Amino acid sequence: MDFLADLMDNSELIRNVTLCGHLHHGKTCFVDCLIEQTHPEIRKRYDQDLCYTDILFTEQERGVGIKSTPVTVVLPDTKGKSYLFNIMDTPGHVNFSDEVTAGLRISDGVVLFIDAAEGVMLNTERLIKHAVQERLAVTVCINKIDRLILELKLPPTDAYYKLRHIVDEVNGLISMYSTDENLILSPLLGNVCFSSSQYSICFTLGSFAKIYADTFGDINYQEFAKRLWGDIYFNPKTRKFTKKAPTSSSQRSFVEFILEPLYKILAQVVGDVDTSLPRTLDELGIHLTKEELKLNIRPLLRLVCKKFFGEFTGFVDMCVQHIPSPKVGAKPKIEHTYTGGVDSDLGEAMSDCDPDGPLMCHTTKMYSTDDGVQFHAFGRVLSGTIHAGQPVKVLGENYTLEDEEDSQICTVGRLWISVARYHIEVNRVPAGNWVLIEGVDQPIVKTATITEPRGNEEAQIFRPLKFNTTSVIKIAVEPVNPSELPKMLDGLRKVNKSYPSLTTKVEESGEHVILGTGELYLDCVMHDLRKMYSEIDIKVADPVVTFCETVVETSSLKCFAETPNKKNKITMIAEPLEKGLAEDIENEVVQITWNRKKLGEFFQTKYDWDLLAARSIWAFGPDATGPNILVDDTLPSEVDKALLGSVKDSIVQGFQWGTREGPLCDELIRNVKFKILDAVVAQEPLHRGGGQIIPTARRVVYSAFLMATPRLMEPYYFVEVQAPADCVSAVYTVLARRRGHVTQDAPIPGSPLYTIKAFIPAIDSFGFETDLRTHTQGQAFSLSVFHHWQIVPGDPLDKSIVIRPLEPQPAPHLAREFMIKTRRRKGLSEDVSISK
Amino acid sequence: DPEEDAPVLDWFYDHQPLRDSRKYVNGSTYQRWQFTLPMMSTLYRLANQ
Amino acid sequence: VFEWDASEDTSIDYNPLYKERHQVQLLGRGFIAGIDLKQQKREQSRFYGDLMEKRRT
RNA sequence: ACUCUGGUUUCUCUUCAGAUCGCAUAAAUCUUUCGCCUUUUACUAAAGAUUUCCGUGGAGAGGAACAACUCUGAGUCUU
Known about the structure:
Chain B: It is found in: Nucleus; Nucleus speckle. Chain B has about 50 residues and is mainly alpha-helical.
C-alpha cells in the first residue's frame, strides 16, 4: 500500500491517461476489470455488472456515465515493473462531452474505446478530433471483441477484415485532423489493443506473443508481435513468416495465431462445457475446480479468460510505450494550455515537472460529497508538491498578472488520492499526479489554477476549459415556494460548480435560465439540483433553445450615433460575413493575437478581401473568438488615424457589448461584418471617455444591425441514428415530422445495422430520442450534438403576421414567434424599437 | 422427434423428469438441477412457441 | 362488471407515430410468443428476406 | 507419483434470515384519503402500518440411509 504513495515520487512510472469513447463501449467495465485484477476482495456478481467507478445514484439507475471518475491504481507491466496509472472514467454520452474535457485537459494520454460490433460512431470521431486539439497521445482499444464471435459469428477472416477496416478508419480520421503523421495506429506498433471487458479479455500483439513465449519458451515476443498483423502469412514447413501465403487457402498470421485460438477458446466454453471443455482446459494449462466448472456460461467464460490472459499487461505496456509520462509529456501540455507560455521562467519551471519547483496545480473537476455543502476540488499537480493543511493562493478564470482580485488565500486541509469510490488520504502529492484538494471550493469556480502565496507572484492561469459543443438548450428554473428561493439559489451555485459547461444566468425578468447541451444533461442536472443540493421542490419551464442574430443584406443607409456630449459621432454600416470565415474564427483558425501582417495576409488571400480592408480590421465579435468582425473604414483623407486610435479601444468594447446582446433576440449576434464609415472624435480626452463612447458604440451597432434586414439563426443538431434496416423508413418519417432533412444513410460495414445522419432543428429536437426509440420499439437509438446555426424560416421584422397562441405556426411565421415569445421570456418590450 | 430431441425424449413426459438421475438432480427432494448444453438447447427449441 | 369498459382503454393516441408502431423484424428469424410461425412468416414485411435474397450469391 | 483424507442421500428438530427468503405472489386487520352511500356483512382504489398463510435460504442438533473405498486436497508425488 505504501508503494502506491512512494511510486508518485518517480515522475516516469506514472501515466496520466483518460478513457474516452462512445456511449456504452466498455470503459466502465474495463476499469472494473482492472480493479478486480488489482483488488482481490472486489468481484462482480454473475449477472449484474460490477458498476464500480460509478458512485452517483443517477449513474447506476440510468446506466449512462455522468461524472468522470478518477482511478489511481498500481499495475505490473509486461516485463514485470509496477507502474502507476491514473484513469479518467469519462461518460461516453455526447451530452456530457464537457465532462470528458475536464478530465481531458489534465490527461497526458487518451485511450479510445471502440466497440467491435458498433463501429466508430459519432462521439468517437468528436473525441479523437478534440484530443487532437490538445495534441494528446492517442491509443485505440477495440473493446467487445466477443461481439464478433458470440453475436455476429463472423468468420475469423471476416473478423480480421472488420478490425482492419475500423483501424484504417480511425487512422484516416486522425490524419484528417492531426498533421503529425507519428499518430499512426497499429497493433504491432503497440497502439491498437484488443479486449472484451465483460469476459476480462485484454491483450495486444505483445501480450499474446508473451503468452506464447511463456507457453513454449525462448521466444522473442517483441519480434514475434512485429510479424502478427496484416497481409503476413506463416509457413509451418519452414516455420517462417512471409508476405505471401505459402498455400492457396492459407490464413493470415493474425487470424492463424490470435483470432483462431480466441475463437476456439470461446466456442469450447459456450458450446462444449460438459463434453470437450476439460480436454482443451487441460491442454492450455488452465485448472478449474469441480465447483468452478458448475458456473453458468458467462461467469465460467470470464473465469477461464482471467486464468488464461492473466494480468491486463497489454493495456499497461500500451500506455507505457505510447502515452508519455508527465515528466516528459509536460512540455506540450504547457505549450498548449498555459497562457504565459513555456518561454517565461514559470513555464520553464513547470515544463520540467519538478517536485521541488514552484507549487502549481490545475484543478478542472469539482466533486460533491454526501452533504453537498462543501465541494472538493480535483486537479493535476503540474509543479511542486501540495501539502495537507497548507496555505495556497487560488486564482480564477478571469485572473491576470494585473488583476489580483480573482485570487484568494485558502488553507488546504486533508487531501487524498481518489480511487473511484474510495480515496487514500496522503500528507502530500508530488508533481504530475491527480489529487483531490479540500478547503478551496469557495474561490474555485470551474477552471482554477492554484499556486503558493508569498512567492511566484508572476504566476498566470491556464487557458479556460474549451468545450467541443456549444450549449444551446435553455430551461428556466424557479422555486415552488419563493420563501425558499435562497436555497434554490444556493443549489444553483453548486450545480454551476459540479457541471463544467453548465451556465446559470439570471435574465432581466428574474428568470434563472440554465444552459444545457441536451435533454439527458439537463435531466441529470435538475435531478441533482432537486435531490442532492437544494433538497426543495423546483419548477421547470418548457425547454427552448437559444437563438443567434445575423444579417442577410447590406445596411440600406449608414447608421449614426452620437455621444451625450454631442461631439463624438460614429457612423457605421452592416454586412454579413463570408462563408466559413465565421467558422474560421470559431475554430481559432485566425486569432486577434496574430500580428496584423499575418491576419491581413489570411483575409486578402483566402477570402479575396482588399489588402487595406484586411489591415483595416479592428476586432472580433462578442469575445476574442466571436464570429463577428469590426473593421475600420474611415478614409485617411478625411479622418485622422492617430486621434481615432485613442477611442478605437472604447469603440471595440462598445461593439463587443453590442454583439453580446443583440437588439432583436437580446443576445448573440452572429456572422455580421461591421464597418465604421465615419468617426468624429472630440478633441479633448474628457469628451471621448469610455462611459460616453461605449453606449454610443452599442447604439450605433444596434442601429446598423437593425437597419439591415435581420435574421434569426436557430441551432441545427447533427443527429446520427444506428438502427436496423427495417427501421430506416420509419426514422425518415420521424425526422420529416420535426422539420429535419436527411443527409446520409450508410449501412455499417460488418454489421446488419444502418446509420442515418441527418440535421434536425434543436428547437424541434426535444423528445426526438424518445420518439424514435418508442416508435421503432427500441431498435433505433439516437444521439444529438450541436452542428451549426442556420437561418430560421420567416422574417423577424414583418409585423403583418399574427401569432396564434398555443399553435405551431407555419415556417414563414416561425421567426417572428421565435423572437416575440423570446422577448416575453426576457421581460423585454413587445417589438424592437428601431429608434432606440 | 427421435433425432432432434435425443437427450430429453427418455424423460420428457415423466412426472418428475429426472428425479432418480443423480447426475442431474441432487436427490428425491428434486432441487438444484444441473443440466447440459445439448438438452437445454433441445428444450429451448421445443419451447420457442 | 364481468367484461371491461372500452373507456378504460389507455392506448388512445392522436399521434400516428404511436398509433402505428413499427413492428420489429427480429432479424427475420425471431418470432413473438404464442402466434404460429407460419402466420408471422406470411405476415412479416420480409424486408430482411428481400435483403437476404439480394445478398444471396 | 504416495500415505491419511471418509462420503452423499433422506427424514426430522432447533434458531437465524440480511438477499428479488419468492426471476413468484395472496388474504385479513388497522389508519388516511377516497367511490358508492342506507344498516351490518361483503366492497370501490391509492397511500401507510402490522399480521396470518402458501413457500425459501443458512446455521446448528438428532436419525436413518450404507456403502466405502475414495473423491478431493495438505505434501514431495517418482523416474
